[PDB]
């Protein structure tokens, strides 16, 4: 009536199931020279047998309780799929044998039992192929471990339900894990089925959202040959990425793991999915120098309060409704049962003496899914049983009949299901028939007692919280590759420090770059800069281009000690001129003072008080008003002083008011008219220039027109030359204590100071070019004050005042 | 047993058939006392009807010929799938009904026929679901239009064969088309099934190798609701990529196309796969402002001779074995068979424009023809087997009257036949067939206003990589117009003055051009690193290419240097005239009155003084700048020391002593010029620090103390002579010589004082222009004062009486 090896028991209501008792089929090649024969399944799976026992224990538990489904019993027909689509299709063609006869009008035993619900398959290709056929007859299929997203399409899979979350949240969780430890450079490996490809595509979308670069991406399989495995290992070994993300199962990853262990490749960081993070085919001590320190996902554990004793009650003779117990007994103890080199089995053997994954578990993660997968169908049937007329889920509020139940009525009550389990948590299904739950994050260690691999919990993924606040990882429990508390470095290129930029594009992806220094006018202080940023105006870049600092303004100042030293030599001149004026005003109507002109000497001593005070326009910060008055002050004061010297000597002044006060006004007026035309045609101005150096701003003054500056100096030098020539011709003539000799000396000192000044102006730098124009004024101003006046002051004031000051003297 | 309407004919060997007579099914989802019923198909498909008629015509043509399978007949049973997996599984269960009883031991009618082979489905999900159920019983399945790569796995699909190539070459061809027209910013759209998804993953894998950046990737479906369509359209119209690559079919693309038409989105470039490049659902003229100008692939054509005449003979009452003809006659003429009027039987098939009779090429109908003939040649190879040469265990043949499905599968695995067009047909180890592609482009007809597909190229799968694609650019209208090739790059290419230089958290295809700073350049049209311009060169103005620098010095061939050279040669040629008059007119009282031998040592020092100015003209070198200053120093101290001991007033009374006072005064400067050059020598120096455009060649003088000593000693010896000669200006002796000595020593100081501003006021190339005139003025002033008045008296008219020993004494 189907497959030979089966577990079945009769009752009023039949359920079906499909479990992996073997890992696969025998690898043989069909040459088709003869009739094809049925294939054999090779490797025994003990986890699958425990999952099968979960169904039987749940069904018997419901059969023993009068709270759930009174006066009604359950049966089962359970087969083996061997992780192959063909054997699953052979079993599910037996599930639909009665339903298909009525649809094909084939009209032969007529005693075929009916299946109203199936606890579905493990893999996601097997489940799709089963659901394709079960959807024709609306038979519900409650899978416990199929987690592909493609089964959430309710246009194609009308009657599919599951008790496991799908793989969108796990891909997003791996993206959060990679983003958490600050990595960019990864690689991906997938199985070539319906479980690997959507997980890798969702992870690729999530990683491309968060700027994570993928180096290599490969597909592997259980039946891939040797050349493909060698090519994948060459792809892995040619890469600098340490972090590798795997969506695969155990049987699909075991060839690649064995090949990587054979070449002994150490130092990779494996990120595991739910299928192989707890797999005993890969969690072996022999491989721990390759796969140590693996970080992986797990489901949430469950409590079945009587299950281990039921596992221990197994026996190959007392299990008459289980056809799978005999081979479990043979593979567990390595012997042979006599059919009613391997020795003969006896019934007196102990389950606890052999370490197999049948009772070596510490948690229940998929067996709890099988437990709820039976209890959901049981509460759907109970919801059918307890209905009151007029309040059903049908047209007129009518109710289905518990004596005559059809599969689509159970499907309709499974679409509206809300029941509380043994822990007090509520179980419902979505509009896509899904169920949601948390994840655990575990890490592979090495036991110090027996050397096996221990899965220690390091964190959780809480699916109910807001986006960005879901992952929790404790870093103090992670051992990277079984040791090495340092977090490993797994991004492409090392970061550029301050004063550099990411700079050069290469043709590689964005994660790989270089480091280039900034120019000499800009600043950059950040890790991984893409450009260099310009300083604001009147700022210049700091050394190493980390920050930007201010700029220094250079001018002659009032408070620096050189300016303080130059102010006192211009104050001393004023208080020496105001002493000569004091002696001249107090000691008037005396022969020396009255012998020459008294009124011209007052106008000469006022012009000297203007010549000393005209040097203070060259000290300080230049502005507009102190550069439009800087040159006319010197010009007018010196032409007034030189005119008063020239017109006073009286030898060729009156013999060739007064006629001598009118030769001063014209000579100063011809300079005033120049200084008015200059300021009303082309005025001087200030300037803040930055062109000599990039770190010093100089404050200088533009003089405007140079012709009006040439006239200003040429007229003064012309008048001093006329005075020098007219005073040189009277040096021997003694009159007023040999005055023309001292006038000649003063006009010589004026030209000596000018000729000494004209080298020094064109050879100095800023803040020192306004330092020569003060000493050039404060040398001529004492040279025109000493020679004319100090000899007469000595005769008037000191001891020659007894006899030398008289009208008899100062005549020869 | 099975579906209601079918096309069925009895024979000795029965073949199956699965064709899409309809496009899809309706939507009904509720379970309120349903006992849910059969789903209805909606839209009629005439192209699928033509494919079904191709299979029927091939079977009838095989049965008419005595040269292929004699004394035997072929039958058929053909169903409809409506592009649905469930509707195909209902028929496939009817196909395997006899074999299924034996496996389950279900045991009854016994009249169930046995199907030998199935002509497979169109879609790549429907074919997978059929192949899963058909591989149990080893019934072969030959598909005419499924092209997914997932069907090439022979561990899972043990009995599946194809007559259409898979989609590796199509995705590689799309990558070659994109690389040919030089784009790097595209987008992708794929159908959400077993057709679109591996093809778009293969295209992504090929496009990462060729440096093509993808902007967006989205998935569509036939039964998508409204919100997904609005989201996909909003993804499309935020992108700057004009090139969109679609890998889907007609019914899955139609809702998105309708939504893009209603929002009037224009300007995009569509790249079509084989499925919708000839689809009439998308190629409506009302959509031409959106999808006009599409570039797509197409298969290779075929020839079936009497096929149109077979198509023109369909009739609802003369087709007794084809139960699909009644709905065809209703849908073609919009009438009703016994508000739609009542049909008569006499309507004309050529009066209605449908895709049934208007095709102009056969592509998939030839695939159905080749499928049926492949099965027939496998049966003929079974039939003509010689005993002892079989393909079975002991070399034994099969039996044609008791044939089974696995025997036909074994023979189809070893099939090699020739078709009506003269080629060879065989399947490889994955049951795959290899073929070329044609590349077509959508135009608008100027007569009917419809859409015309014009061949612009071919893709050749038998050539070496990089030599497969052929495209004729002269035949492409890029949107129904616009012969210019469009632009799809993320950023425009940089120029030679700039560099490709930013990173934004954006893909490598997107950048911006940063201009090179003053001093750098590039010289390529896409440069990832701006280059520093080489040494002694500088950027021009736009940093697109840089030019050399200008070296600044006073030169021999510039006219100013020529003028200085002439003014220095005139002094030598005037000194050699005074020396000629002094040598010819010797033992005469003017020449003999002073020291004659000491006046020959002064006209040599003047010849050295004029020639010492030629070290300041030209390019500075190491030897010129090491002899530039000592030559001036020794020549001027010799020329001043020969004047100092010549006046004779305080020289011999305060060739015995004059030469021994010349020698010490020149030796005291020779020792300085030896210590300076053997302790701290001067050197040449090229400097670029003043300006970035001009290099200056100047000279470092080394120590400044040994430079100050020369000038100080020279001015000291010129001041002592001035003081000693000023005190004798009135004394008349040898024609008032001390007055002229005073004038010469005054002119020397005037030239020095005039020189000292101009050295510190000039720039480069003019600072060596003042040091020549300052030497050529002192050298003329130390000659004109001394050696002209005497020459005038000796040579010209005062030679009669003034030159005598009675004169030149007072
Ligand atoms: C104040 C002053 C007029 C300089 C000055 C000072 C004191 C002096 C004492 C006696 C006599 C002339 C004197 C000139 N400001 C002008 C300055 O900007 C620029 O000056 C020059 C710059 C170049 C060449 C010459 Cl030829 C001069 C002068 N001259
Ligand atoms: C050739 C020379 C010695 C300049 C020279 C030329 C002709 C001259 C004629 C008469 C007398 C002295 C003369 C000096 N090269 C020196 C030059 O580099 C630098 O010179 C100076 C630079 C700054 C200050 C002074 Cl004080 C001098 C001089 N001096
Ligand atoms: C768009 O970008 C592509 C590549 O990103 C540019 O194609 C390059 O053009 C230069 C100039 O002849 C060639 O040297 C390169 O070999 C081309 N690249 C490739 C990959 O072939 C194309 O020119 C750009 N189009 C623009 C800027 O209009
Ligand atoms: N859900 C996985 C299968 C799976 C989950 N947990 C497992 C444990 C063991 C083996 C397989 C599994 C899939 O879709 O393919
Ligand atoms: N190649 C398509 C099938 C196909 C080819 N041409 C078509 C024309 C119309 C519809 C479907 C098709 C597939 O694999 O799915
Ligand atoms: C790359 O690695 C560095 C450590 O070298 C780390 O600080 C950084 O966050 C990583 N990720 C980036 C740049 O995205
Ligand atoms: C890996 O690198 C080696 C270099 O020795 C090369 O030969 C090989 O083809 C590479 N494999 C890849 C890129 O898959
Ligand atoms: C393999 O790699 C491990 C890692 O350190 C090393 O200890 C060992 O020596 C290597 N070789 C073998 C043969 O195990
Ligand atoms: C299930 O029932 C509980 C209690 O009646 C209710 O609080 C909860 O919202 C229900 N769940 C759903 C999905 O309706
Ligand atoms: C998931 O985890 C969070 C916090 O760890 C917890 O509050 C929540 O109850 C968990 N979910 C379930 C269904 O227990
Ligand atoms: C597209 O543009 C709209 C309008 O600005 C914007 O709201 C949306 O976020 C953009 N992106 C996508 C993916 O739709
Ligand atoms: C669509 O837009 C184009 C220009 O963008 C315009 O010519 C055309 O008429 C539009 N079609 C409509 C509004 O139907
Ligand atoms: C198929 O038949 C042709 C015709 O003789 C022959 O040339 C060819 O070698 C055969 N085999 C293959 C694999 O094409
Ligand atoms: C395929 O394309 C090439 C290029 O034109 C051509 O030579 C060849 O004949 C075509 N057909 C076949 C069957 O190879
Ligand atoms: Ca009970
Ligand atoms: Ca690359
Ligand atoms: Ca025949
Ligand atoms: Ca991005």
Curated annotation (Swiss-Prot), chain A:
Region (Cysteine-rich (CR)): 492-562
Effect of residue 415 to Q: In HHC1; loss-of-function mutation; the quantity of the mutant receptor is higher than that of the wild-type receptor; dose-response curves show that the mutation significantly reduces the sensitivity of the receptor to extracellular calcium concentrations
Organism in which the protein naturally occurs: Homo sapiens
GO biological process, one term: regulation of presynaptic membrane potential
Protein name stated in the entry: Extracellular calcium-sensing receptor
Phenotype for residue 439 to F: Reduced calcium-induced G-protein-coupled receptor activity
Membrane side Extracellular: residue ranges: 1-560, 619-624, 682-705, 765-768
Impact when changing residue 519 to H: In HYPOC1; increased G-protein coupled receptor signaling pathway
Effect of substituting residue 758 to W: Increased activation by positive allosteric modulators
Protein residues bound to Ca(2+): 62, 65, 68-69, 81, 122, 147, 165, 167, 208, 211, 274, 439, 507
Phenotype for residue 10 to A/N/E/D: Increased calcium sensitivity
Task of the protein: G-protein-coupled receptor that senses changes in the extracellular concentration of calcium ions and plays a key role in maintaining calcium homeostasis. Senses fluctuations in the circulating calcium concentration: activated by elevated circulating calcium, leading to decreased parathyroid hormone (PTH) secretion in parathyroid glands. In kidneys, acts as a key regulator of renal tubular calcium resorption. Ligand binding causes a conformation change that triggers signaling via guanine nucleotide-binding proteins (G-proteins) and modulates the activity of downstream effectors.
Outcome of substituting residue 554 to K: In HYPOC1; there is a significant leftward shift in the concentration response curves for the effects of extracellular calcium on both intracellular calcium mobilization and MAPK activity
Glycosylation site residues: 71, 238, 264, 350, 396, 418, 438, 491, 544
Impact when changing residue 157 to C: In HHC1; although the mutant receptor is expressed normally at the cell surface it is unresponsive with respect to intracellular signaling (MAPK activation) to increases in extracellular calcium concentrations
Impact upon substituting residue 83 to I: Abolishes G-protein coupled receptor activity
Family: Belongs to the G-protein coupled receptor 3 family.
Transmembrane segments: 561-586, 599-618, 625-648, 659-681, 706-725, 742-764, 769-790
Region of interest (Intracellular loop 3 (ICL3)), ranges: 726-741
């Amino acid at each position: 009536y189907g497959p030979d090896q089966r577990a079945q028991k009769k009752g009023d209501i039949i359920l079906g199931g499909l479990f992996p008792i073997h890992f696969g089929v025998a690898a043989k090649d069909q040459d088709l020279k003869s009739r094809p024969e049925s294939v054999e399944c090779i490797r025994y799976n003990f986890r699958g047998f425990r999952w099968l026992q979960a169904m039987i224990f749940a069904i018997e538990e419901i059969n023993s309780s009068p709270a759930l489904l009174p006066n009604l019993t359950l049966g089962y027909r359970i087969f083996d799929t061997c992780n192959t689509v063909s054997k699953a299709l052979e079993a599910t063609l037996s599930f639909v044998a009665q339903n298909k006869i009525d649809s094909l009008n084939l009209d032969c035993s007529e005693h075929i039992p009916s299946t109203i619900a199936v606890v579905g398959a493990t893999g996601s290709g097997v489940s799709t192929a089963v659901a394709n056929l079960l959807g024709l007859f609306y038979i519900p299929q409650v899978s416990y471990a199929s987690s592909s997203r493609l089964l959430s399409n309710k246009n194609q899979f009308k009657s599919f339900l599951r008790t496991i979350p799908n793989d969108e949240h796990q891909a997003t969780a791996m993206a959060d894990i990679i983003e958490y430890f600050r990595w960019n450079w990864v690689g991906t490996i997938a199985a070539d089925d319906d479980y690997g490809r959507p997980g890798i595509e969702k992870f690729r979308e999530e990683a491309e959202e968060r700027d994570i670069c993928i180096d290599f991406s490969e597909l592997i399989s259980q039946y891939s040959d040797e050349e493909e495995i060698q090519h994948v290992v060459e792809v892995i070994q040619n890469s600098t990425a340490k972090v590798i993300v795997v969506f695969s199962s155990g049987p699909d990853l075991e060839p690649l793991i064995k090949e990587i262990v054979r070449r002994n490749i150490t130092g990779k960081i494996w990120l595991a999915s739910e299928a192989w993070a707890s797999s005993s085919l890969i969690a072996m001590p022999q491989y721990f120098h390759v796969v140590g320190g693996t970080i992986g996902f797990a489901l949430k554990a469950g409590q079945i309060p009587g299950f281990r004793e039921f596992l221990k009650k197994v026996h190959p003779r007392k299990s008459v409704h289980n056809g799978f117990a005999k081979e479990f007994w043979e593979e567990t103890f390595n012997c042979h049962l006599q059919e009613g080199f391997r020795p003969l089995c006896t019934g007196d053997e102990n389950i606890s003496s052999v370490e197999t994954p049948y009772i070596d578990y510490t948690h229940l993660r998929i067996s709890y899914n099988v437990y709820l997968a039976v209890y959901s169908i049981a509460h759907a049937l109970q919801d059918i049983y307890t209905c009151l007329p007029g309040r059903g889920l049908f047209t007129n509020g009518s109710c289905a009949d518990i004596k005559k139940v059809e599969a689509w009525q159970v499907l309709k009550h499974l679409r509206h299901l809300n029941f509380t389990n043994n822990m007090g948590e509520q179980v419902t299904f979505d509009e896509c028939g899904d169920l949601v739950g948390n994840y655990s994050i575990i890490n592979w260690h090495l036991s110090p007692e027996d050397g096996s691999i221990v899965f220690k919990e390091v964190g959780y993924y809480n699916v109910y919280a807001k986006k960005g606040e879901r992952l929790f990882i404790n870093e103090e429990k992670i051992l990277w590759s079984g040791f090495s508390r340092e977090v490993p470095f797994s991004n492409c290129s090392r970061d550029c420090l301050a004063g550099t930029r990411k700079g050069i594009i290469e043709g590689e992806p964005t994660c790989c770059f270089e480091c280039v220094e900034c120019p000499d006018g800009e600043y950059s202080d950040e890790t991984d800069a893409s450009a260099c940023n310009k300083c604001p105006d009147d700022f210049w870049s700091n050394e190493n281009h980390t920050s930007c600092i201010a700029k220094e303004i250079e001018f002659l100042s009032w408070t620096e000690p050189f300016g303080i030293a130059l102010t006192l030599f211009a104050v001393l001149g004023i208080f020496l001129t105001a002493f000569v004026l004091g002696v001249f005003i107090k000691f008037r109507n005396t022969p020396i003072v009255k012998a020459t002109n008294r009124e011209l000497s007052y106008l000469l001593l006022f012009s000297l008080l203007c010549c000393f005070s005209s040097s203070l326009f060259f000290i300080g910060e230049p502005q507009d008003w102190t550069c439009r008055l800087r040159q006319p002050a010197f010009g007018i004061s010196f032409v007034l002083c030189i005119s008063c010297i020239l017109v006073k000597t009286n030898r060729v002044l009156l013999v060739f008011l007064n006629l001598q006060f009118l030769l001063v006004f014209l000579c100063t007026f011809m300079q005033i008219v120049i200084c008015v035309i200059w300021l009303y045609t082309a005025p001087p101005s200030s300037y803040r220039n930055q062109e000599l150096e990039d770190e010093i701003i100089f404050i200088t003054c533009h003089e405007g027109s140079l012709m009006a500056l040439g006239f200003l100096i040429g007229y003064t030098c012309l008048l001093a030359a006329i005075c020098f020539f007219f005073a040189f011709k009277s040096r021997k003539l003694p009159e007023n204590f040999n005055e023309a000799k001292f006038i000649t000396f003063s006009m010589l000192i004026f030209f000596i100071v000018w000729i000494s000044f004209i080298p020094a102006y064109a050879s100095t730098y800023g803040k020192f070019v306004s330092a020569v124009e003060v000493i050039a004024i404060l040398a001529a101003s004492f040279g025109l004050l000493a020679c004319i006046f100090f000899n007469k002051i000595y005769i008037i004031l000191f001891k020659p005042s007894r006899n030398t000051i008289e009208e008899v003297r100062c005549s020869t």
